[PDB]
Amino acid sequence: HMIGITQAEAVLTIELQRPERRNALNSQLVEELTQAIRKAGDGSARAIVLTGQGTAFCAGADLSGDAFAADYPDRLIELHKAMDASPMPVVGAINGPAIGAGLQLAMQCDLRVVAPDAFFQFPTSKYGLALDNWSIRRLSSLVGHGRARAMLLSAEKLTAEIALHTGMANRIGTLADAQAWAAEIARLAPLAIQHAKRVLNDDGAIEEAWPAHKELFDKAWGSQDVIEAQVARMEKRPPKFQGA
Amino acid sequence: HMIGITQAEAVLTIELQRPERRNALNSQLVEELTQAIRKAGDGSARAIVLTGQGTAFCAGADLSGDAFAADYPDRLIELHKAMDASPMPVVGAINGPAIGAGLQLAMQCDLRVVAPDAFFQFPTSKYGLALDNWSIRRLSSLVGHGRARAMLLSAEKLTAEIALHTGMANRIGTLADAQAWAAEIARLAPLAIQHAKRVLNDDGAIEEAWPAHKELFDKAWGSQDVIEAQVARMEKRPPKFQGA
Amino acid sequence: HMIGITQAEAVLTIELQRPERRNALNSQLVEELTQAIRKAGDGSARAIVLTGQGTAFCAGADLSGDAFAADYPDRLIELHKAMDASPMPVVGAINGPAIGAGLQLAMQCDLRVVAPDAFFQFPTSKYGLALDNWSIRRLSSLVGHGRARAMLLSAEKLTAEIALHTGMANRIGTLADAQAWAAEIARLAPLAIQHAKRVLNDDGAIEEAWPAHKELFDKAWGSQDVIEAQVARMEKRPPKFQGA
Ligand SMILES: CCc1ccc([C@H]2C[C@@H](C(F)(F)F)n3ncc(C(=O)NCc4ccc5c(c4)OCO5)c3N2)cc1
Ligand SMILES: CCc1ccc([C@H]2C[C@@H](C(F)(F)F)n3ncc(C(=O)NCc4ccc5c(c4)OCO5)c3N2)cc1
Ligand SMILES: CCc1ccc([C@H]2C[C@@H](C(F)(F)F)n3ncc(C(=O)NCc4ccc5c(c4)OCO5)c3N2)cc1
């Protein structure tokens, strides 16, 4: 009910379909993507393309209304496991902005074809929040350590031009471009692709948070600044953080 | 009988001399390269330039009509060991294409001066094969993870301009260019260079394969798809891989 | 006495004020720096800008006239610990060349805004010296492994232009630019920044040197070539290294 699924030749295209919220994730959306990724190759498909409907790829996470929001973080982890564990290459057609949870998602794709007006952002420094280590490690691997510092420490937007520069984007193109490419890849030797993907993903980025990292994480998440940042956002005013 | 070794100033130039197979590696050539790396600086030389004769640096591996062809994987590991252990900086003059084993050898150099019309490639995904972890890790560090994903998951070529971009190439230039640069390096303090090499090479790229990596590596190498890739090539036709 | 410290808005600007020596790091300047960083946030400041007076950011370590040389490394280390431990983002306003220790100090900043005439260099291979692992890892993460090899193995200069390209420079700008950016960062949630800073700094660059690394490190440092570099410099001539 919240995603689209079409197959052409050997390419499964999975389309996020919640444009009314710029494809922000929730319990139901996340759980359907998961079933969809798991059930691909069932199936003569040999490559997956992932994309958003409308103007965004995925603008983050919106749990308003969501009855199982408590379950969301767990379902989200399952979704990333499901992708990571997939023997099928996932080609992200990043049709528009990919922010926060959406950025994580885009980064969990195996390759990325980015629309010219797309951008990537972790606005965590604006919301007093904190990321898991993987998000940071993978981000670093894709934009270089230096830019990752700017992105995490100052909510810097990574434009499409620069994503291509750093390697975040493999290509600047459209959904069609990404489907063409996915079809080439569908004709390649699956086991070779299975191997490379497993090793690539095992580059270290999947890291358990050090003891001090969990501290700072929890401290950030339980802070009053977290509440201040939301009220500010809602009021369309600058936030006045207290560092607590 | 299969390579050329000349020395000028304090620069040893080792040339692969099998242009009739585009300098494709085999038992003998690997053995002779190993010897030449070790016997280097015996000898007053403080720097090595490694290059290929003809249009290509090294197009892959051959073995066709190769008497001691079974201990070739072994002799190739010896070569990489020798190069990694040489107290001498090795400047690769990548005069042309560097593919598969050729790309490995190119990466095992300490510096790279790339000709405009050279490209690098791991076509393992087109042939149903799997690489060793180091090939993957070093590649990632030289082209960036993002671009490494494209080269490995879809057999994408790395052109010279892009090599310069990411740092795979330090310079775009000729053999002569590389040799002149090597002469400068020959006048720097050996012990400084020797320390830096060891540490740089010890960045973790030299990684034992995880269980899952050995398993997938082995499935691929013993797969039917490997035969299918070759017979399809021999029949000048699209391969139809089973994933097995 | 040796650094200037001002605060505007919520930004602490610390200026290295030894331009007569191109801001090279002497035992005392190091301590004053260390103290200034620790004592920051004491303090309504939420961000630090670290810059140099005159034409150079920092031309390296001093030691000339130092009656207590042996203690110098421990002070330089202390300074890095202080920066690494600071909950405050340090934006380096790299107003000119950052060489050796200068480059280390620039790399321990959290973000770098670089002047168009500036450049970064480890001329260690010109002096028979060797670096600690962190300098090597962090450098590789900032300019890419390929360019890290060139810089370390041949003393290659990283221009502002290419620092921007690789991520070593987040921006090309003036001190004032760096200060405007810092002011912004100062209005972001500190706890978010503190977390990302810790995790980022814990990417592995902070590495205990391996047995072989110490061995080579000591070997270079204790070498005769180290003296020869100093002598040739003074005698205004090309060094003549021996590898011992
Ligand atoms: C196995 C493949 C894989 C699995 C999960 C991830 C990421 C995904 C990503 C998200 F779901 F948000 F997108 N994500 N988010 C949270 C986690 C995650 O790993 N959470 C567990 C956790 C517990 C305590 C912590 C902590 C993390 O950080 C500091 O203290 C986590 N892990 C990334 C890759
Ligand atoms: C110590 C310096 C050094 C030594 C060797 C290498 C690479 C070279 C590169 C090549 F020889 F092909 F060029 N290469 N190829 C194979 C190996 C290699 O290390 N092979 C052993 C091995 C056994 C089982 C495996 C496995 C690897 O991968 C998954 O399952 C290997 N090691 C790279 C660096
Ligand atoms: C915890 C944050 C942090 C602390 C220190 C460093 C760097 C700084 C950098 C400098 F101070 F020069 F700028 N630096 N210099 C020396 C050290 C340093 O760590 N020295 C200890 C050491 C002992 C024996 C060794 C060895 C290192 O390398 C090979 O053999 C060292 N550590 C880098 C990051």
In angstroms, rounded to a whole number, what is the distance separating the alpha carbons of residues C179 and C47?
9
Task: Identify the helix (H) or strand (E) that includes residue B98.
Answer: strand B98-99
Query: In a mutational test of the pocket of ligand 1, which residue from A80, A201, A207 has the highest number of ligand atoms less than 8 Å from its CB?
Result: A80
Using a CB-CB cut-off of 8 Å, the residues of chain C touching A208 are none
Contact B102, B124 (CB under 8 A): no
The minimal CB distance from A153 to the residues C197, C203, C204 is found for C197
Contact A99, A60 (CB under 8 A): yes
Contact C24, C18 (CB under 8 A): yes
Q: CA of C145 to nearest chain B CA: how many angstroms apart?
A: 6
Degrees to nearest 5, angle at CA B69 with B68 and B75:
85
Secondary structure, 3-state, chain C:
CCEEEEEECCEEEEEECCHHHCCCECHHHHHHHHHHHHHCCCCCCCEEEEEECCCCCECCECCCCCCCHHHHHHHHHHHHHHHHHCCCCEEEEECCCEECHHHHHHHHCCEEEECCCCEEECHHHHCCCCCCHHHHHHHHHHHCHHHHHHHHHHCCCEEHHHHHHHCCCCEECCHHHHHHHHHHHCCCCHHHHHHHHHHHHCCCCCCCCCHHHHHHHHHHHCCHHHHHHHHHHHCCCCCCCCCC
In angstroms, rounded to a whole number, what is the distance separating the alpha carbons of residues A156 and B40?
50
What is the spatial order of strands in the sheet that C98-99 belongs to? C98-99, C119-121, C158-159
Ligand 2 cavity residues, CB under 6 Å: B 76-77, 80-81, 84, 101, 104, 132, 134-135, 206, 209, 213-214, 217
Query: In a mutational test of the pocket of ligand 3, which residue from C26, C33, C77 has the highest number of ligand atoms less than 8 Å from its CB?
Result: C77
Contact C119, C58 (CB under 8 A): no
List the beta bridge partners of residue B6: B13
User: C39: which residues sit within 8 A by CB, 6+ positions away?
Assistant: none
Strands B171-172 and B111-114, bridge-based pairing: parallel
Q: What are B's interface residues with A at a Cβ cutoff of 8 A? A: 124-131, 133, 136-137, 140, 143-150, 152-155, 166, 204, 209-210, 212-213, 216-217, 219-220, 223, 225-226, 229, 238-239, 241, 243-244
Neighbours of chain B (3+ CB pairs under 8 A): A, C
In angstroms, rounded to a whole number, what is the distance separating the alpha carbons of residues A185 and B1?
41
SS3 at position B14: strand
- In this structure, chain B runs to a length of 244
| Cβ neighbours around A123 below 10 Å, total | 20
What is the spatial order of strands in the sheet that A98-99 belongs to? A98-99, A119-121, A158-159
Q: Taking the domain B1-244, which CATH number applies?
A: 3.90.226.10
User: A23: which residues sit within 8 A by CB, 6+ positions away?
Assistant: A16, A17, A29, A52, A53, A54, A56, A57, A58, A59, A102
Strands C158-159 and C119-121, bridge-based pairing: antiparallel
In angstroms, rounded to a whole number, what is the distance separating the alpha carbons of residues B48 and B178?
10
Alpha-carbon A40 to chain mean position: 19
Query: In a mutational test of the pocket of ligand 1, which residue from A31, A132, A135 has the highest number of ligand atoms less than 8 Å from its CB?
Result: A132
Please state, in angstroms and as integers, the Cα–Cα distance from residue C48 to each residue in A149, B81, C187, C195, following that order: 15, 46, 13, 17
In angstroms, rounded to a whole number, what is the distance separating the alpha carbons of residues B85 and A17?
55
What would the two tokens of residue B219 be? 């499935």
Contact A114, A164 (CB under 8 A): yes
User: C139: which residues sit within 8 A by CB, 6+ positions away?
Assistant: C103, C107, C122, C148, C151, C152
C153 with B89: Cβ contact below 8 A: yes
What would the two tokens of residue A211 be? 């003891």
In angstroms, rounded to a whole number, what is the distance separating the alpha carbons of residues B15 and C4?
57
What would the two tokens of residue B101 be? 């084993």
Give residues preceding each break in chain B, C–N over 2.5 A. Answer: none
What would the two tokens of residue B223 be? 């797969």
A142 with B146: Cβ contact below 8 A: yes
Contact B115, B72 (CB under 8 A): no
In angstroms, rounded to a whole number, what is the distance separating the alpha carbons of residues B187 and B47?
9
- In this structure, chain A runs to a length of 244
Experimentally, the structure was elucidated by: X-ray
Secondary structure, 3-state, C173-231:
CCHHHHHHHHHHHCCCCHHHHHHHHHHHHCCCCCCCCCHHHHHHHHHHHCCHHHHHHHH
Degrees to nearest 5, angle at CA C162 with A172 and A133:
65
Contact B158, B151 (CB under 8 A): yes
B192 with C219: Cβ contact below 8 A: no
Residue of C121, C122, C125, C165 best to disrupt the B interface, most CBs of B under 10 A: C125
C191 with A128: Cβ contact below 8 A: yes
Which residue from B233, B141, B225, B159 is spatially nearest to A193, judged by alpha carbons? B225
Task: Identify the helix (H) or strand (E) that includes residue A193.
Answer: helix A190-201
Alpha helices in B86-236, H assignment, sequence order: 101-108, 124-127, 133-143, 145-153, 160-166, 175-185, 190-201, 211-221, 224-234
Radius of gyration of chain A (CA): 18
Give residues preceding each break in chain A, C–N over 2.5 A. Answer: none
Å resolution of this model? 2.7
Residue A177 CA to ligand 1 center (angstroms) comes to 31
